[model samples]
Target: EKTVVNISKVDGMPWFNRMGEGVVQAGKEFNLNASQVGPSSTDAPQQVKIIEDLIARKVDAITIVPNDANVLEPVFKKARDAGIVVLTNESPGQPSANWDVEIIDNEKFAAEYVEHMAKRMGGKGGYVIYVGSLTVPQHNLWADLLVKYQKEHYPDMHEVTRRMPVAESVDDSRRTTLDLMKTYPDLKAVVSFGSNGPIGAGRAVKEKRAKNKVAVYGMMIPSQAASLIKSGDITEGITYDPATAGYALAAVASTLLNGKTIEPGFELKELGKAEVDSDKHIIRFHKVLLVNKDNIDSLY
Candidate 1:
């Protein structure tokens, strides 16, 4: 059987590179001809084009972490109609795929991050959100849930702006963060929902010498944000093992291709017994890791 994992971004980023390792390892162990591909830039159209090519190749399965779920729906539907088993990660609850796999429950993940941020801010302060893009489904979901949670639990905690689009550019995040800091002197936290959000926001905090005053929190790779965490610029981060997620996605694709079933109590190699939502065809593994200065050095 042939399978391919198409990531949202290119290969140079450490996050996707680590994910690639798991994909390669799973292919070796399962004896499947699997490969990972993506666009050099974070463009939704670029990803759609790649999928079109994969469809032309007549691959058995195609797993993708989409840059924009809505934009890829038609292509994903086409792939499925053509008999390709499609699985997705990051874009939870995606309607066009056979199954959507997640390392953490999206709602709970957002709530947990906001809960931590509220506590760190002493329950009342101004904060802003940065997403990879407005079109990124998972990022927006996290941002919206975070806002809703704060409104319900911490009414005094104000969201300075609607979710901003930074397109995963560190320079853009940093520049926008600096502007926010200037606009709202009382801004106490910067919450990013993308991988590059915390890194860029942390840089701004360090540049302004506001490490003790302003906090940066988001979903970031520990290794990439290690120095910022050590310096107390980035307050906290939430991440799962990307390699493990990659491995599990591959395992699921393999299982489906072989005419097997992934029921509620079914166990997988990477993620233990999965919580299968048959209605939505989503398989979730609830194992999220927290990254802070105390144990940043040990995490990869």
Candidate 2:
């Protein structure tokens, strides 16, 4: 059987590169024809075209991390109808996949970050959020849950600015962080839901020499944030292993193709036993890793 894992961005990015490692590894383990595909840019249209081409190639399974959820629904459905196994990650409630896998529960994941950030900020301060894009469902869901959790649990932690779109650009995140620091002198933290968010925010905090005063926390690539984390500019970050997720996706496709049932407690290679929401065909493995000064070095 042949399979393809379509990443959200090009392989140059550390996040997708790590994920591709797992895809390649899984292909070797299963002795199947598997490859990782990605676009030169993070454009939804480009991803759509890639999927269309994969369909034309008649690949057995196509796994994707969607750049935009709505834009890929129809194509995903087309692939499914064509008798190809479709798997998705980082995108829940996707209409076209046979199974949607996640490294953590969305609500619980966001709440954990909020709790961590609140404690770091002494439970009371102003904070802002940055998402990859306004249309990216997972990022927006994380941002929304962060706000809701903060309001309900840490009443003193106020959102100083509405959600901002940074297009996963480190430069944009840095500029927005600097501007927000100027606007809200009392801002205690900058929470982000994209890999580039903490990298940029931490850089801004370091340049302004406010590491001791302000905190940066959220989902960040550890290798990218290692220096800032050691400098104490990035307070903490929560993320799952992208490589593991990629491996799990391929494993799931292999199991399904073999006529195996992925019921509750099914142990997947690299992902352990999963919690299966059979109705939606969602499989989740809850293991969110914390990145900080102490363990940052071990994350490559």
lDDT by residue for model 1 (1-300), tens: 566555545546777877887888889877678778857787888888888998998888888888888888999999999999889988878998888888887778878877898888889899999988888888888888888888889998998877789737789999999999999987999988777888889999999999887889887889999999999999998778788778878888888888998788867865688789988888998888899888898888
Model 1, C-alpha of 163: deviation from truth (Å): 1.1
- What are the per-residue Cα lDDT tens digits for candidate 2 across 56-140? 9888888888888889899989988998888988788888788888888888888888888888788988998888888887888
Candidate 1 stretches with Cα past 4 Å from truth are none
Superposition error at 285 for model 2 (Å): 0.1
Regions more than 4 Å wrong, model 2: none
Each model's total of backbone clashes = 0, 0
Worst 10 residues of 1 by lDDT: 2-11
lDDT of each: 0.84, 0.84
Q: How displaced is residue 37 in candidate 2, in Å?
A: 1.2
Error of 1 at 215 (Å): 0.3
